[PDB]
From Swiss-Prot, chains A, B, C, D:
Protein name as catalogued: Ferritin, mitochondrial
Residues of the full protein shown: 65 to 236 of 242
Enzyme class label: oxidoreductase
Catalysed reaction, written as an equation: 4 Fe(2+) + O2 + 4 H(+) = 4 Fe(3+) + 2 H2O
Family statement drawn from the similarity comment of this UniProt entry: Belongs to the ferritin family.
EC number(s) reported in the record: 1.16.3.1
Amino acid sequence: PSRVRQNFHPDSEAAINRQINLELYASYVYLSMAYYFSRDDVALNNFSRYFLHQSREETEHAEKLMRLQNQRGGRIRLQDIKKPEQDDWESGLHAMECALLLEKNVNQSLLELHALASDKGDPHLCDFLETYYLNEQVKSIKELGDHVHNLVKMGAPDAGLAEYLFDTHTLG
Amino acid sequence: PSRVRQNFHPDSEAAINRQINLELYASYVYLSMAYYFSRDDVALNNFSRYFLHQSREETEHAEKLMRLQNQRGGRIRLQDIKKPEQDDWESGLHAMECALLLEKNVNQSLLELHALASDKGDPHLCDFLETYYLNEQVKSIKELGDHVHNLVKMGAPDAGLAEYLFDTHTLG
Amino acid sequence: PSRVRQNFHPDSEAAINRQINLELYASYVYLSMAYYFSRDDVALNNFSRYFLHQSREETEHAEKLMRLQNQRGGRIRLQDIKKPEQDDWESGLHAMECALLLEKNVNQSLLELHALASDKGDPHLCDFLETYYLNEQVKSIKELGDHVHNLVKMGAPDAGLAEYLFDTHTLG
Amino acid sequence: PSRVRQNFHPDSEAAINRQINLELYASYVYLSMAYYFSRDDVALNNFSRYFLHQSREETEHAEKLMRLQNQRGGRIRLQDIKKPEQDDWESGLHAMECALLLEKNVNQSLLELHALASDKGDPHLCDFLETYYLNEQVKSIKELGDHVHNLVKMGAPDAGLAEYLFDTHTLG
Ligand SMILES: [Cl-]
Ligand SMILES: [Cl-]
Ligand SMILES: [Cl-]
Ligand SMILES: [Cl-]
Ligand SMILES: [Cl-]
Ligand SMILES: [Cl-]
Ligand SMILES: [Cl-]
Ligand SMILES: [Cl-]
Ligand SMILES: [Cl-]
Ligand SMILES: [Cl-]
Ligand SMILES: [Cl-]
Ligand SMILES: [Cl-]
Ligand SMILES: [Cl-]
Ligand SMILES: [Cl-]
Ligand SMILES: [Cl-]
Ligand SMILES: [Cl-]
Ligand SMILES: [Cl-]
Ligand SMILES: [Cl-]
Ligand SMILES: [Cl-]
Ligand SMILES: [Cl-]
Ligand SMILES: [Cl-]
Ligand SMILES: [Cl-]
Ligand SMILES: [Cl-]
Ligand SMILES: [Cl-]
Ligand SMILES: [Mg+2]
Ligand SMILES: [Mg+2]
Ligand SMILES: [Mg+2]
Ligand SMILES: [Mg+2]
Ligand SMILES: [Mg+2]
Ligand SMILES: [Mg+2]
Ligand SMILES: [Mg+2]
Ligand SMILES: [Mg+2]
Ligand SMILES: [Mg+2]
Ligand SMILES: [Mg+2]
Ligand SMILES: [Mg+2]
Ligand SMILES: [Mg+2]
Ligand SMILES: [Mg+2]
Ligand SMILES: [Mg+2]
Ligand SMILES: [Mg+2]
Ligand SMILES: [Mg+2]
Ligand SMILES: [Mg+2]
Ligand SMILES: [Mg+2]
Ligand SMILES: [Mg+2]
Ligand SMILES: [Mg+2]
Ligand SMILES: [Mg+2]
Ligand SMILES: [Mg+2]
Ligand SMILES: [Mg+2]
Ligand SMILES: [Mg+2]
Ligand SMILES: [Mg+2]
Ligand SMILES: [Mg+2]
Ligand SMILES: [Mg+2]
Ligand SMILES: [Mg+2]
Ligand SMILES: [Mg+2]
Ligand SMILES: [Mg+2]
Ligand SMILES: [Mg+2]
Ligand SMILES: [Mg+2]
Ligand SMILES: [Mg+2]
Ligand SMILES: [Mg+2]
Ligand SMILES: [Mg+2]
Ligand SMILES: [Mg+2]
Ligand SMILES: [Mg+2]
Ligand SMILES: [Mg+2]
Ligand SMILES: [Mg+2]
Ligand SMILES: [Mg+2]
Ligand SMILES: [Mg+2]
Ligand SMILES: [Mg+2]
Ligand SMILES: [Mg+2]
Ligand SMILES: [Mg+2]
Ligand SMILES: [Mg+2]
Ligand SMILES: [Mg+2]
């Protein structure tokens, strides 16, 4: 093994590689959403900026796991980054609801990773997830829930002023 | 009696202890309201901030009466702080209407305290109430009346944009 | 359930509501102590300031749990805040000893909450307690133990200079 | 009458002249105390400074009443300023206890003046007393009560370190 490797189970190494792919996938989904909102027939520039920011954060989530792999003496194994489920995200509300589902799916993956690290007696990996990932996910899910609630109450997507005003106020 | 006590009737001392409890109760009601508005299914962050500010002001109202008790040589007697009437405050409009009723009830208690201080020939206590409490209550009741009127006219709670826009403009 | 809720057991939600009440109770105990020390027949202004500061910290402990409840999609359920065990706290030493007992009781409640979160496989809640509560309690208990030791050694409460000098030096 | 005089009863004018004399008397008592504490066989320089400050405040209390008399169209009538009851004030504790008795006697005089102004339907004079005198007296009596309590508990006047340490800490 690597002369740095210590208390680092091969199953943990493999699960970190799968999580890297999921974070890169999330970045790509948010990039897709960002450029949907800058279409001439959508033109919600603060929705665009919001999702572009989220995309860049997901790349940093991927990089911190890649750094962890190297720190612990594992070997990064990259896989294809699947295209998102849609190019046409339909509305500001629909994109927010899809983001919320994505963030809960990423959270479930992180909770499974934490359970595996716990089973393998890897407190360093548990602390890493608890310090950089699990509260970030709770905050992200709460923010998206807030946004979905306001957009639904305002009458999105069919009420003509709702997404326009949410874009200016909340995302401005 | 306390070597500081002078012209301070036991009935005034007792009424000050009851007012301390009412101010602490008002703080708790406003704390409850603040955290209702930060629920994921309410998510009106400026309503939240408004009521949190009101909560902290009520604690200062309680503390100034506690200080008065000590200044005059009375003895503070604390009682349970009752839970608010609701955890679910229903809407921005309903919370504002409940706040308005609370502030008029607190005002009536202060007016009764002033009448008692007058009956007991306690001009220091009358001046204390007139300087720190009675105009504060008039201003608070007027502000809440303004807010209720605007929210009703805008169509709250059922008009989808009303509480959202009041939160951004008036409470922003 | 709330569209944000994930891996959040109803027993954890209920235990968080009980902890909120205990933090609000601790705030009230420390408020009582603060205003005992500003009585004309006690007049230890730095003891007063010390306990007032502790009171305000406990309100922030309550608020962070209220925020956690909302973040995780639980529902805050407030209860009466019981009055403290005493209005007359007897001496600087006695108040410090009562504070030490309170902080150990709050610590035991937090340790039980951590054990419950562990049993329910809630690493987010475990990390929250470990990050914001458990070391805060250890530091608070140690500080109060230091203060009790010095006051006992100095001869409090009966040695006429002891609480006066502790107030000026240690709490000044 | 004076072309300014309005709603100003001769009994109020006379009571203001008596209060002017009492404030000038209080200034003289505090001047006496200040210079007792700078004797070579007393030499408590912060007790001296404390009472000198109180003396100068009493002169300002006298001047504000003299200004009120002129503002309302009354005529100032000065009388002898009686010497204080003692040149030898015995101890720091005894001077503080005598100051406390003086301030309660001045407070009783002000409360009688307020009752007279009330009987004569003079709200300007009532407000003047409530704004500049009655809370000043409550604060002064409370401070002196605090000081007396600490000096008694510390063992003054017989405990050799008590007045020395109170002078350095509390009055420093
Ligand atoms: Cl290994
Ligand atoms: Cl592949
Ligand atoms: Cl693949
Ligand atoms: Cl472990
Ligand atoms: Cl909703
Ligand atoms: Cl607008
Ligand atoms: Cl009395
Ligand atoms: Cl009770
Ligand atoms: Cl009760
Ligand atoms: Cl009166
Ligand atoms: Cl209306
Ligand atoms: Cl605007
Ligand atoms: Cl759940
Ligand atoms: Cl209850
Ligand atoms: Cl209860
Ligand atoms: Cl766990
Ligand atoms: Cl000890
Ligand atoms: Cl010292
Ligand atoms: Cl006249
Ligand atoms: Cl004369
Ligand atoms: Cl004379
Ligand atoms: Cl009048
Ligand atoms: Cl005493
Ligand atoms: Cl020192
Ligand atoms: Mg080697
Ligand atoms: Mg391998
Ligand atoms: Mg995958
Ligand atoms: Mg753009
Ligand atoms: Mg991520
Ligand atoms: Mg494919
Ligand atoms: Mg384990
Ligand atoms: Mg950790
Ligand atoms: Mg953290
Ligand atoms: Mg995020
Ligand atoms: Mg906003
Ligand atoms: Mg006495
Ligand atoms: Mg009594
Ligand atoms: Mg009541
Ligand atoms: Mg907020
Ligand atoms: Mg109030
Ligand atoms: Mg009940
Ligand atoms: Mg009257
Ligand atoms: Mg009046
Ligand atoms: Mg007044
Ligand atoms: Mg005013
Ligand atoms: Mg107010
Ligand atoms: Mg406006
Ligand atoms: Mg849904
Ligand atoms: Mg339930
Ligand atoms: Mg409890
Ligand atoms: Mg103080
Ligand atoms: Mg606490
Ligand atoms: Mg009870
Ligand atoms: Mg476990
Ligand atoms: Mg752990
Ligand atoms: Mg942790
Ligand atoms: Mg820490
Ligand atoms: Mg602490
Ligand atoms: Mg020290
Ligand atoms: Mg003329
Ligand atoms: Mg005349
Ligand atoms: Mg006289
Ligand atoms: Mg000097
Ligand atoms: Mg005076
Ligand atoms: Mg004579
Ligand atoms: Mg009248
Ligand atoms: Mg007035
Ligand atoms: Mg005033
Ligand atoms: Mg004074
Ligand atoms: Mg001091």
